[PDB]
C-alpha cells in the first residue's frame, strides 16, 4: 500500500463484510471501494494508529 | 611526520600556553601509501638531546 500511490488503503472493519473480512480484521482494499461504499455506510474506518488501538 | 594541527603546536607553543590551552596531540600513524617517506612520528614538544 506504501507504493500504491493512493490506490490501496489499509481498512479496519467494524462489522462483518461479505467478502472484505470479519470484524476486527485489518485488510487491504481498493481506495474506490472504501471511498464510496464501506466508509459512508459506516462499516469500517481507516487504519490509523488510534483507530487500530481503539477497534482492532 | 606532522599533521596540520601538530605543526602549529611545534612552531608556536606560546600561542597555546598564553591562552591556557593544552597543546595539540601527536598523530598515531601515517597512511601506508607514504611508507618510505617518514621515519618517526613527530612529538609536539620535541625531545632535545646532546650532540
Amino acid at each position: 500500500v506504501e507504493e500504491s500511490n493512493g490506490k490501496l488503503v489499509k481498512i479496519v472493519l467494524l462489522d462483518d463484510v461479505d467478502r472484505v473480512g470479519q470484524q476486527g480484521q485489518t485488510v487491504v482494499v481498493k481506495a474506490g471501494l472504501m471511498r464510496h461504499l464501506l466508509f459512508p455506510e459506516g462499516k469500517a474506518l481507516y487504519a490509523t494508529p488510534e483507530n487500530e488501538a481503539k477497534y482492532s | 611526520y606532522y599533521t596540520k594541527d601538530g605543526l602549529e603546536g611545534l612552531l608556536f607553543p606560546k600561542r597555546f600556553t598564553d591562552k591556557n590551552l593544552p597543546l595539540p596531540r601527536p598523530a598515531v600513524a601515517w597512511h601506508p601509501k607514504f611508507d618510505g617517506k617518514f621515519d618517526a612520528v613527530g612529538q609536539i614538544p620535541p625531545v632535545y638531546e646532546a650532540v
Partner: protein
C-alpha cells in the same frame, strides 16, 4: 525563496501567464499538498535553457464527512487525496490541522464549519454522558 523568484523570472512569457492563472485558483480549491513544478530543458549541442511550467491535474471527488453527514464536493490533486486518505479522512484532516497550514479560503471556511459543529455535538454529548 530568493531562488524561487529567480527561477520564476526566467519562465517563458507564455508560461508566466499560465503560472498566474494557476495561482489565482488557490482560494477556489482545496490546495492541500499541491506544489509548483518547473520544467527545464537542456541540450547537448548548445548552451541554451528553456523554462516552462508543469500543469496540475485536478480531480473532482465527493468525500464523506460523518460530522456533517454529507458528501462534500472537492477539487483535489492526487497527492492531496492520498494524504487525506492516509491521515484518516476529511474529518481528521480538518481537525488535525491548524488554520495556518490550509492556505485556502475554501479550505478555511470548510474547516471552520466542521470545528464549530464538532464542538456543539461534543458539548451536548458530554453533558449527556
Amino acid at each position: 525563496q530568493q531562488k524561487n523568484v529567480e527561477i520564476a523570472r526566467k519562465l517563458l512569457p507564455l508560461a508566466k501567464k499560465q503560472l498566474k492563472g494557476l495561482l489565482d485558483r488557490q482560494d477556489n480549491v482545496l490546495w492541500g499538498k499541491t506544489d509548483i513544478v518547473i520544467r527545464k530543458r537542456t541540450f547537448k549541442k548548445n548552451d541554451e535553457e528553456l523554462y516552462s511550467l508543469v500543469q496540475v491535474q485536478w480531480l473532482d471527488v465527493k468525500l464523506w464527512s460523518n460530522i456533517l453527514q454529507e458528501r462534500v464536493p472537492l477539487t483535489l490533486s492526487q497527492e492531496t487525496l492520498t494524504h487525506i486518505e492516509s491521515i484518516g479522512g476529511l474529518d481528521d484532516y480538518l481537525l488535525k490541522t491548524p488554520d495556518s497550514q490550509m492556505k485556502s479560503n475554501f479550505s478555511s471556511d470548510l474547516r471552520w464549519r466542521v470545528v464549530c459543529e464538532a464542538m456543539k455535538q461534543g458539548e451536548a454529548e458530554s453533558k449527556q454522558k
